[PDB]
Design a protein around this ligand. Structure first.
Ligand SMILES: [Zn+2]
Ligand SMILES: [Zn+2]
Length: 223
């Protein structure tokens, strides 16, 4: 069984996928309803790297503090996968702590438009990063859940962070489609399936970790 570690109220939890990769999950509170959100923690020889922040600054601060204490190293970098609050809500905390906040230019453009502090806008359609020995690829597959959503691939593990482009099994509909492109979203998923033909685990933006079947599930929800 996978190691799971929580804060006191259970609003932040980390679950181990392998020696150096954990999923972080936080509960936001909205109209009295708990709404969970996932990202990744990468434990690298040169610091911790997160995929996504959290709903707000309070949660982002607590997440950073938890992982820095546990892994005994600093959070150095975060990859922001689109400009909604569950992804980027902690950007003020990142910037003031000197944590590098990577994003596409479009994500940065949308963040600014919406009144958030800006991430770096450094990621291209395909970008390859390396942190210590940890390899990370970012990929913009096209519009879907939002116009700017990217996925993150760990080629040493064939782990895909689908983010909010990819729905969990428990999701029975597409959720928030105000900012979505539902006629393009299938093609974007197909672009991911074509790029990564052998996938070991898929982390959705919300809900339980799964596998390639989550991509197929999302295709079915788009019919
Ligand atoms: Zn979103
Ligand atoms: Zn989301």
């Amino acid at each position: 069984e996978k190691t799971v570690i929580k804060n006191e109220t259970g609003t932040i939890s980390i679950s181990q996928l392998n020696k150096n990769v954990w999923v972080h999950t936080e509960l936001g509170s909205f109209d009295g309803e708990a709404v969970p959100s996932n990202g990744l923690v990468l434990n690298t020889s040169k610091g911790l790297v997160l995929v996504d922040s959290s709903w707000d600054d309070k949660l982002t601060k607590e997440l950073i503090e938890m992982v820095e204490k546990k892994f005994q190293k600093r959070v150095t970098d975060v990859i922001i996968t689109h400009a909604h609050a569950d992804r980027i809500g902690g950007i003020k905390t990142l910037k003031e702590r000197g944590i590098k906040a990577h994003s596409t230019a479009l994500t940065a453009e949308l963040a600014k438009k919406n009144g958030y502090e800006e991430p770096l806008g450094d990621l291209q359609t395909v970008t390859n990063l390396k942190f210590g020995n940890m390899k990370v690829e970012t990929f913009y597959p096209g519009k879907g859940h939002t116009e700017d959503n990217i996925v993150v691939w760990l080629p040493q593990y064939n782990i895909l962070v689908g983010g909010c482009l990819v729905k969990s099994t428990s999701a029975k509909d597409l959720g928030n489609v105000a900012d979505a492109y539902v006629n393009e979203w299938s093609t974007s998923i197909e672009n991911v399936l074509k790029r990564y033909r052998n996938i070991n685990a898929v982390v959705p933006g919300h809900g339980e970790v799964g596998d390639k079947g989550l991509l197929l599930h999302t295709l079915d929800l788009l019919k």
